[PDB]
Amino acid sequence: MLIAFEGIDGSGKTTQAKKLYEYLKQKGYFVSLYREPGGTKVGEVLREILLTEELDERTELLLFEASRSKLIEEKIIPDLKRDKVVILDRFVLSTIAYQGYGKGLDVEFIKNLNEFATRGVKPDITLLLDIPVDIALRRLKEKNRFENKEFLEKVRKGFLELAKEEENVVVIDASGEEEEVFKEILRALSGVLR
Amino acid sequence: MLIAFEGIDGSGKTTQAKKLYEYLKQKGYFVSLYREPGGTKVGEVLREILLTEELDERTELLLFEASRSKLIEEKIIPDLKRDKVVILDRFVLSTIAYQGYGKGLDVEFIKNLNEFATRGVKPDITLLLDIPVDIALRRLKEKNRFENKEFLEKVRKGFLELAKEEENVVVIDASGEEEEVFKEILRALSGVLRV
Ligand SMILES: Nc1ncnc2c1ncn2[C@@H]1O[C@H](COP(=O)(O)OP(=O)(O)O)[C@@H](O)[C@H]1O
Ligand SMILES: Nc1ncnc2c1ncn2[C@@H]1O[C@H](COP(=O)(O)OP(=O)(O)O)[C@@H](O)[C@H]1O
Ligand SMILES: Cc1cn([C@H]2C[C@H](O)[C@@H](COP(=O)(O)OP(=O)(O)O)O2)c(=O)[nH]c1=O
Ligand SMILES: Cc1cn([C@H]2C[C@H](O)[C@@H](COP(=O)(O)OP(=O)(O)O)O2)c(=O)[nH]c1=O
Ligand SMILES: [Ca+2]
Ligand SMILES: [Ca+2]
Ligand SMILES: [Mg+2]
Ligand SMILES: [Mg+2]
Ligand SMILES: [Mg+2]
Ligand SMILES: [Mg+2]
Ligand SMILES: [Mg+2]
Ligand SMILES: [Mg+2]
């Protein structure tokens, strides 16, 4: 297996996760790629609620966890049982960084919810795509995506603290060009996977 | 003043909550009536998912709590700030009885989620409509609703244990006629509210 991509909006997660998916398929792995929230029919409904409705921060946390629970039970656990490489575009560190460090919700509580939703399933490696917020925001602005700079500075700092506190997290310099970032990822992956 | 109706499917909650809503409105209270899950636009979408999609028991728990959180923040807390009497058709005991006693999820974990979703808001009184499962099932059969006898027997017993452990839960014998059950509810309510 399980490879998680983490990092702020605009760090290149969706781009890199797709590159890694295609690369590992070509190398002969059986691989799955899922996004969080989403990745199942029910999860995609919850994703649309999360991205379109005005929600309070507590309802948001519970819906992220509900989407994760469905994806874990429906797809990830069955995939891992069949020795598929599962790549996730976001996972439990995003919930801690955004809902905990960003929104101020209790992190011990978030971690208990994460454990409940995941049944204790943990990544073999987490690739934290680290990038200065101003650089990320300029990438996003090009595609008419806007995120709050004050909020994301807290989240960025939170991810970096988590890379020291949580297990199996490798910090990737995501400021570089696409192929350069991918090479860094492949170097990090050689720590857990042929 | 927060008044919660609890009990198994077919115990008369929706019937009696509406009766109470009308009665208190006539007596000059400003009253709200909400159902769980549901009661908000988002909560109603979540209710539809809960009632129509195949879900694992953990995802179910989290959606029940998400609906509760939305209702608490959007409607319940603002209503209580305005001195409205808020009547709930189900609340936190339903989660402990169904997801805990029924499905076997950890009760302390469920209580922590309850506290999170509610911001610690507790009812002034909870009316547990207790009824034998057989009676409930026969009332539901008349309306083409079917529920699982084995499951509901565990849930009934769970509610009854909760009525002993949790604060301000009154057990109502709800197997009698509708008008008699309502009279018992009013007698119970007189302990906390001028009715
Ligand atoms: N290494 C890179 N350098 C510059 N732009 C990039 C790079 N990687 C991705 N992008 C572009 O930046 C934006 C954000 O990338 P995306 O993969 O959507 O990030 P995330 O999923 O982390 O928000 C997209 O427009 C994408 O094409
Ligand atoms: N006291 C009662 N005796 C007989 N039937 C009842 C009584 N109260 C309600 N009913 C009927 O039983 C069914 C279940 O009532 P309802 O209020 O929907 O229960 P709940 O909301 O607890 O499932 C409905 O068809 C309703 O009209
Ligand atoms: C998985 C997850 C995402 N999110 C947020 C991050 C994003 O702003 C939003 C949607 O996710 P996503 O589409 O991955 O954002 P992006 O491509 O911009 O990185 O959901 C949380 O707040 N908590 C979570 O647990
Ligand atoms: C509020 C709540 C309801 N439920 C279940 C009980 C019901 O079978 C279902 C829908 O609620 P509802 O329509 O109140 O059922 P009924 O009128 O038959 O009592 O949701 C839970 O499992 N957990 C919860 O926390
Ligand atoms: Ca650019
Ligand atoms: Ca460089
Ligand atoms: Mg993305
Ligand atoms: Mg906050
Ligand atoms: Mg965790
Ligand atoms: Mg009902
Ligand atoms: Mg179970
Ligand atoms: Mg509770």
Asked if A167 and A122 touch (Cβ cutoff 8 Å), the reply is yes
B49, A42: Cβ pair inside 8 Å?
A: yes
The alpha carbon torsion through B52, B53, B57, B60 (nearest 10 deg) reads: -70
How many Å lie between the alpha carbon of A70 and the closest alpha carbon of chain B? 6
Closest CA to A91 of A11, A12, A13, A193: A13
Helices assigned H by DSSP within chain B = 13-26, 41-52, 57-71, 77-81, 92-95, 107-118, 133-142, 149-165, 178-189
DSSP letter for each residue of B96-147 = IIIIIIIT---HHHHHHHHHHHHTT---SEEEEEE--HHHHHHHHHHTT---
CB atoms within 10 A of CB A72: 25
DSSP state of A76: I
- A57–chain B Cβ distance below 8 A for any pair: no
Domain count, chain B: 1
B73, A59: Cβ pair inside 8 Å?
A: yes
CB pairs below 8 Å between A and B: how many? 62
Residues 6+ apart with CB under 8 A from B1: B29, B80, B83, B85, B86, B124, B192, B193
B170: helix, strand or coil: strand
Distance CA A188, CA A129 (A): 12
Closest CA to B189 of B23, B75, B9, B14: B23
> Residue A50, class by beta-carbon neighbours within 10 Å (0-12 exposed, 13-18 middle, 19+ buried)?
middle
Angstrom resolution of this structure: 1.7
List the single best residue of B50, B70, B75, B99 to mutate versus A (max A Cβ within 10 A). B70
Asked if B102 and B68 touch (Cβ cutoff 8 Å), the reply is no
Closest CA to A16 of A192, A191, A193, A172: A172
A136: helix, strand or coil: helix
Distance CA A54, CA A60 (A): 9
Ligand lying closest to the C-alpha of residue A131: 1
Residues of B in contact with A58 (CB under 8 A): 69, 73, 116-117, 119
Q: Which of left, alpha, beta for A88 (phi over 0: left; psi -120 to 50: alpha)? A: beta
Distance CA B174, CA B133 (A): 12
> Residue B100, class by beta-carbon neighbours within 10 Å (0-12 exposed, 13-18 middle, 19+ buried)?
buried
A38 CB less than 6 Å from ligand 3? no
B66, A63: Cβ pair inside 8 Å?
A: yes
Question: What was the experiment behind these coordinates?
Answer: X-ray
Residue length, chain A?
194
Asked if A170 and A128 touch (Cβ cutoff 8 Å), the reply is yes
Q: Is B49 annotated as a binding residue?
A: no
Residue B139, both tokens: 């009332």
Residue carrying structure tokens 């998680």: A4
Q: At A38, phi and psi to the nearest 5?
A: 110, -160
Mutate to test the pocket of ligand 2, among B6, B11, B14, B15 (most ligand atoms within 8 A of CB): B15
Asked if A98 and A152 touch (Cβ cutoff 8 Å), the reply is no
Q: Domain with A169 in it: what CATH number?
A: 3.40.50.300
Task: Name the residue range of residue A31's domain.
Answer: 1-194
Taking CA atoms, A120 is separated from A40, A72, A83, A114, A185, in Å, by 20, 10, 17, 8, 25
Give exposure, A15-46, as e/b (b: 16+ Cβ within 10 Å): bbbebbbeebeeeeeebbbbbbbbbbebbebb
